[PDB]
């Protein structure tokens, strides 16, 4: 559905909105337009964000409609290896 | 509702008023109006307490209204942070 998986997503569905907001900002850099060292970590951290709620939005989709063969093990192995590389 | 919240919240909602009452009181500063160190200490201490209390105060919340889709684990990920922060 629409209104209802909005409603069931809560903020987890929000969050690619606040981190794309979040990375503009980044390419406006704030304080200062510039990059190196801390700019790489925070972004690399608002990608592991990215991602945390990522694996809360797919928690969400295999069990408000059907559970299927996904094995969340898999998923969060390709989280970690995505946040490894 | 209102008395059948207050009831429900028992000290836990209380300690947000004691913790803004033990903060006018460090603002006085009690036995001389000082700070350093241990100041920052005791501050950081009750700056806990509080969180530690606001974490029993959502968790009422959502047991006598609707457990709903909050997943504690992510809002004492987040007490924790703060705490680091
Ligand atoms: C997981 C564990 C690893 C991750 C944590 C440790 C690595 C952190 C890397 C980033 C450090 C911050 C650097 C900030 C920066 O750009 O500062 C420059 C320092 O450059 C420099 O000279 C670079 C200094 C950083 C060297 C890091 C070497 C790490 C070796 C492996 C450690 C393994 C544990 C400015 O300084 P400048 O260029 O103007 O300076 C020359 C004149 N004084
Ligand atoms: C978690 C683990 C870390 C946290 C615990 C350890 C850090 C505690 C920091 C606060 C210590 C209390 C300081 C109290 C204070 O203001 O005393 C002054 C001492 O100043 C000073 O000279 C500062 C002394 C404190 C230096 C702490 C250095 C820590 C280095 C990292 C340790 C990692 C383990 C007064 O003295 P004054 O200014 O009049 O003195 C100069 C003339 N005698």
């Given at each position: 559905e629409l209104f209802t998986?909005?409603?069931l997503n809560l903020v987890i569905i929000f969050g690619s909105c606040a981190a794309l907001i979040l990375m503009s900002f980044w390419f406006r850099r704030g304080n200062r337009k510039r990059k190196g060292f801390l700019?790489?970590?925070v972004q690399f951290l608002?990608?592991?964000i990215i991602i945390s709620?990522?694996?809360?939005?797919?928690?969400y989709v295999?069990?408000?409609?059907?559970?299927?063969?996904?094995?969340?093990g898999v998923i969060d192995f390709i989280c970690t290896s995505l946040i490894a590389v």
């Amino acid at each position: 559905e629409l209104f209802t998986n909005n409603a069931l997503n809560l903020v987890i569905i929000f969050g690619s909105c606040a981190a794309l907001i979040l990375m503009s900002f980044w390419f406006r850099r704030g304080n200062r337009k510039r990059k190196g060292f801390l700019f790489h970590a925070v972004q690399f951290l608002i990608y592991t964000i990215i991602i945390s709620a990522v694996g809360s939005i797919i928690n969400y989709v295999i069990e408000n409609y059907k559970l299927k063969f996904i094995t969340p093990g898999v998923i969060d192995f390709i989280c970690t290896s995505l946040i490894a590389v």
